[PDB]
Every structure is written in structure tokens, then in C-alpha cells.
Amino acid sequence: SAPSIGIAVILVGTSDEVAIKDAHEKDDFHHLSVVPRVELVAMNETDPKSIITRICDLMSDRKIQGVVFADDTDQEAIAQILDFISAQTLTPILGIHGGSSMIMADKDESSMFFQFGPSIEQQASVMLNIMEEYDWYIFSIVTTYFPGYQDFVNKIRSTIENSFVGWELEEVLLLDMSLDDGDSKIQNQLKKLQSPIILLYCTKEEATYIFEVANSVGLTGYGYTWIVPSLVAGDTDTVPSEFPTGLISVSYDEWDYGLPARVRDGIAIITTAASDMLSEHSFIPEPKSSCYNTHEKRIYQSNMLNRYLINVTFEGRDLSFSEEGYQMHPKLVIILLNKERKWERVGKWKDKSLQMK
Amino acid sequence: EIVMTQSPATLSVSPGGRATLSCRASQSVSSNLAWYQQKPGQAPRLLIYGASTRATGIPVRFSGSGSGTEFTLTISSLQSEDFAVYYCQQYNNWPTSWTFGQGTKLEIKRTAAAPSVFIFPPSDEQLKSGTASVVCLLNNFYPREAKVQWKVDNALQSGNSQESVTEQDSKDSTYSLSSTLTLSKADYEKHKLYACEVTHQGLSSPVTKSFNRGE
């Protein structure tokens, strides 16, 4: 008998509302006494003017304690706005799909913004795990000025010596694509490389040009079995048309994890954390109904939720987040590019175990 | 320090044809030039700035080029309202150098037309004041380059002849020339034969009109 816990389900992807309405609150959580409320909101605008105003008006509507956010564009600047608004207003929000699911480097240290997806280190770990399985020991790395490149090579170097298997790394690059009139230098550098296995680190806006110059020079024929992270693939349905055949990469599960499941488990995690804290400490935080005037509304700190939202399990799943806010235990799948310009699934990775076909 | 020079001094072209004018660069002007178009009696207008960009509200016929080496323009598909005085403007060390150009003269080509030669003696009223003037009129001749000589008693006259040339007409693009003399009453009455000799390309032979005083 502890009702009125406020969660708002913001929808921007314009998917079937009734399909996800049928799964938002269909179940009855008899173990946890929160009996939550949901309120589906459908929008068509992704401007920061409408996002902030809409969230503030919703907070002024009726005392909402959380928000789950969805999207359909590949915008990389909605996560930042969400993190900032969650920092200023202590309501914790989670991003489950689309533009609000791209991992941000480091959130505001006072913010509560938990996303869905893997970090950079985990991608490198699984990428090296597939490489070890088929014994492609020799490798080389090329990188640019992008996040985690230092962390990428540091994770590569940290696990290169803790295993008895004899990795033999050679060559490292630091050149970035932002140079002006430096195409001759980049061409000479890429012509220099002749290593068997190469692991790239670049993004589609620059990866298009990188692939174009690599194909133009001619270092793309057979022996160039590239290995790329998820962000190189971008969107499966769209191809930049360079994409040398034999490309392998690992991407977050986007086919067998539908939107209703994500909405259901986000509501479940918020409700479980809130109900556990309510059962233990016998009180629940409640922010004021003023979005703008939160300067004096931070009298009651809400770090207890931040320490109680990162360790939650239900239905035999571990949904534990981390300090930086990533999933910390995702489900990743591996795909392959065949002769026809399309991707095909091969295997699944879960709980540090690789099961391929 | 940078003397602005163009070529040629004058240019005559037929209707429906192109024209090319080059404004010589006396030094290394980086990219700055400006060509102006002015009709007689009117203020000029802007056509090009930066030696490559057309002015706003201008027809697209005009164009030019040059990055420091003898900037030149190329006008095509010309019409009758063209053929005005065209200047060139530079600005390298602005706002302190500001060397101007000269401005070539443009004319419209036309077939030769025989001038109409007329003479006019004093009307007997100007001679009362003690001065007499003789007016020789040329009407509707092309080109304007014609030679007019005054024969007073079969003697060459110089230092007392004034000539006025009208601008090209808007209908037939013709030229008009008027010769005016200024002599004293005593000198006027000392001679009886006054002749106006006109030489033109459109005339097979020179035309001379003569009259006698008091006749």
C-alpha cells in the first residue's frame, strides 16, 4: 500500500503505441509494493527546445520520479541533453533505444543517467576473444583522435601479457583525419602498413573517407581481413559501398531485443529499486514541482537511489549498471559481411562466454 | 605608384557583337579590381568587384578574370544600350593608395552616311554689336571623323574656328557637327567670300558651300 511512484515513458520513435502499451504495465508486481503508474507520451520533435520544455511540463504535471527515453534517429546529441537535465533535476532517466543509447564518455558526477549498451573496453575484450578462438595471433592497430583510443590501446596492452598465448603486436598510429592538406601523409602512412590483422578505430563520417582513400590506394584486395567495432557498422540497412568483403564486427543485439521488452525491463528496474529502498528505509524522495527553480529544491539529497539503482536482478537476469553508467553485462552478437552487401549473424556472447556457429 | 592603363584608347563595334577590354596592371595587385559603366551625363554604376564577382542586379553577360596579371573582361551578347565609357578601379593599400583609371571610349559601328552641309550668314542683328559669326551645320553623318575647313577669300583660317559635336542619337546613332566662327565687324566687312569645305568618307567629293556678303 505504497502507491504513486511516477514513471513517464517518453516516445519519439513513432512505433506502435498500443503494442508497447500492452506490455508497459501488464504484469502485476506482487513481490514489490510500488504499484507504479505509466504515461505514454508521443512526440515528433527532437529539438532541445521541445525536450526540455516537455520534460519540465511533465514534471510539473504530477510528481514524476523517473523517465525512460526512446528514439529513432541516430543523433548523438540527445544523450548529452538528457544527462544535463538529469543532473540539474535529480529525477533519474534511462535511455533504451535510438539516439539516447550511444555511450557517453563520462557523465556529470552528480547525475543519474543510465544507458543501454557496451563500453569501449568490453568491445575490445570480446573482439580479442573472437580473435583468440581461431588463432589469428598477429595483429596491428591504427587509431585517430577519438574517445577511448588511449583506453582502446591500453585495454589491448593490459590483456596482451596476462595470458600465456603469444600475441605479437606491431605498429601503432596516432594520426587524425582533421588535418588540412595532409592527404599525402595519410596516403604514405596507410601504404606503409602491411600487417596481417588490423583493428581499426574510426567513425562513419570519417570512416567513409578512410575507406575511400584505402580503396583508392589499393590496400584492400585479399589479405586485409579488417576487424571493426560496433560504431563502424553504423546502420545495418545502409552501406557506404566501400566495405571490403570479409569485414567482421560485433554489435549490440538490435534484432531479437524488441522495444516492448526494453520498455518493460526499464519500468521493472526503476520500480524494483524504488520498492526495495521503500521497504528498507521506509521513505521515498519527492522533488518539488518546479523545473526551473531547483536551486533551492536540492535540500533532500537523492544519492540513495544512485547507490540502490545499480544492483538489481529479476527474472533471473543481472541488470547491474556501473559507475560510468553502461550496462556492464550486455548481450552482444557477431555479424559477417558476405559477397552480397549485407550482414549475417553468426553467434552470441553472454556472461563472458562465446557460442558461435 | 600604380599608374592605371587600358587598351585600346577607343573601340567601335557593330551591334550584336562581343567586346574585350584589358586594364593593364602596373604592379602586383592581389585580386582587387572593379569595372564601371557610365552613360554620358550620368553617374557610373558598379559591375564587378574582386575582379571575379558580378555586382548585384546586373545582367549575366559581363564577366572577367585575373589574379594579378593583366585583368581582362569579356562581354558577350551585347545590345544597343551598351558601348559606354568603361573604367577600371583598384584597391591594394586601401584606404590610402586609391589609384583611379582613365576610361576607354566606346562607339557603335554603322554604315557611312552622307552629311548634310548647310551654311548660315549673320542675321544683320549680331553685326550691330560689332561681332559677326558664321555657322556651318553638318547633320546625320557617320563616322564622326570628318574634316571641316574654312575658306575666307580662298585663304586658310586657323585660331578662330569652334566645333561642337553632339552625342550619338538614340534612333539612328548619327553624328552632328557645327562650325562657328568669331570675327570682328571690321574684319568681317573686309572680305566677301566665305566658304565651308566639308570632307567625309561617305562623300565621293568634298562639299563646299559659299556665300557672298550682302547677297
Binding site: 526540455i52 546529441a77 548529452q80 541533453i81 540539474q88 583522435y145 582533421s178 536551486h295 | -
Partner: protein, 371 residues
Amino acid sequence: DPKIVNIGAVLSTRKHEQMFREAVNQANKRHGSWKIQLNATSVTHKPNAIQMALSVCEDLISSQVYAILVSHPPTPNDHFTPTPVSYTAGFYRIPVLGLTTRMSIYSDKSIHLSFLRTVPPYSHQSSVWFEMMRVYNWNHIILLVSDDHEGRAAQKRLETLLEERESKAEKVLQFDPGTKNVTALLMEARELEARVIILSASEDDAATVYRAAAMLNMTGSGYVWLVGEREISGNALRYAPDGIIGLQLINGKNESAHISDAVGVVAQAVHELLEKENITDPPRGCVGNTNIWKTGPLFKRVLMSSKYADGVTGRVEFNEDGDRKFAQYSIMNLQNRKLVQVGIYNGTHVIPNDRKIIWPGGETEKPRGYQ
């Protein structure tokens, strides 16, 4: 005839807004206004951090600005001040220039994606420590950095600079921020063979560390310290042992100079960019538009490679991350409770002065910093 290209500014202190307007009016006088006549549009800071974002969105909509200048408010807290501006007018990827902020989170050009700075961050002073270390012949230093995004950048920069010379630091301690009792770390640094101590922390934590070290006999005769700029100014000035060597940016508060320099740089970039076809106007309307500026990254690429000829603060280059390469510093020593300047850091080397230096505990003779 000319197409007006108005640029914005969110600087405070209205007199500074009039100064910025005069600066832009002088800026468009030198070049000319037959093709480009850039306007001005200012606004003042607001207390809370949401109305600031709403107002910057409003003026972005109302003026379709090309670049935004952001400065510090008159109520310190200059860490989260240009946070809403960068997020809001970087969603559309339009450049933003920071005039005074020195925090090191903005150098990460992936969370902001458009942020140029006219002052080097707090982590660019570590090179001064390395150069003065080399000059004075100390080679057994101890780091005492904090645990945050601010101390980690400084420790990373100093560690890379040290490893490049085939050297190493004796230890790298790390105290949690906002602590009111640190004695175990001080003792751990106390029993060792290293005397040079290097600090990097906020002024409050610097005061606590100074108090802890003064309680012990650690500010003795051969314990030469080394600090930065934030550990000399404020509450930490009066709680300081004699002979504490520190730095200070030479021009980091004259906002007039920074306003003039930013206006000049932006004007040069704008007049340089339009000599190029296939451009698009910025997205006027913050409530209807949802897309990236087409020529957005191109403007940043042409801005981040402009060498301003001569300014009041000197040459204005741009390191290949967007923060004010080649800056100057001033070195001071806390003599008799009144700081006196000694030496200077010309950006490449260190030029010693004629004024003598008093090491900790008197001892005008130099200490070797070893045992």
C-alpha cells in the same frame, strides 16, 4: 547589398556587452561592408541552468547566429557555467568560443564537439613543472594529485612527458576530493627518499593539505614544494609555508582583451569562409528545425587553423584540440607573506630573473631535494 551575418555573445556585465558591441563595430570597419556586414546580438547570464539553455535556444532561433562567445558570471562557480550553451548550440554543431574558463573537461572534444578556447586549461601548466624541474636539477619528485577529472589530466600529461625522457616519479598519491582529514598520505610521503612535492588540487583541499603538512615537521629546510595557480589564490594563501613556488597566467582576467581577440578571430574566419561555394544558412528557428547544419564542421575546420596576426594578448594560435597553444606564465615565490615575481615562462623555456628566491625554512642556498 551586403548579407548581414550576425554573431552572438552570452557574456555578462552589461558594460562588457556594450564593449563587445563596440568591438564588433570596429571589426567590420577594418574589412569593409560591401559584401559582409556582421551584426551583434548580446544577452546576459541567468541564475539557474535551465532558463539559460532556453534563452540561448531563443536567441539562436531569433538571430540565426554563426558563432557564440561565452564568458564567466560575477558569482564564481566557473565550471558548469558554459555547460548549457555548449550542449544547446552544439546540438546543431555551431562553433562556441570560451573566453575565460580553464576547466579541463572541455578539452575532451567528443562531449562538446564544438568548443574553442582562448586560455589554456588547468592541465597545461604541468609542462612548466617539467621545464623548471629540468632547469633546477631535481629528478626525484612526488606527485600528490587529487581524484577527479582535473587531477587525472595533469597526472597523465606529466607522466607522458616524464616517460618520454626515460625517467619516472617516485610515487603518485591520490586523495579523495572534499576530504577533511589527510595524514596517512602525508606520512607515506614523509618516509621516502624524495623531497620535491608537486600539488594539484582545489583551494580548499590545498588548505587542508597545507595545514596537515604544517602540523608535522614537513615544511622544514630541505622540503622544496611546488604548486600551480589555484593553490595560491583564495583561502589557501594565508595557510601557506614560506617559499612555496607557484605560477599564474599573465592575462586571465582582463575580459576586454579576450573579447577583442575572439571578435577579431571570428571576423577573420567569417570573411575567409565565404570565398567558397555550396554553403547553407544556419537553422533559424529552434523549435521547428531538427537536423545538423550542413556546413558546420567546415566552419570549425577553417576556424581552428587561423593564426591571428597581432592581438592585445599576443599571437592567437590553436592547439590541435582547441585550446590556446603557446601561452605565457609568471613564477612567484611567497616571501614574507607577500608574493613576489621571479622568472618567467616564455612558452618554450624559462628565463630566470635577478630577484633572489628564499627556499622553505630560509636557506637561500639551493636544496638538492634528495637524501
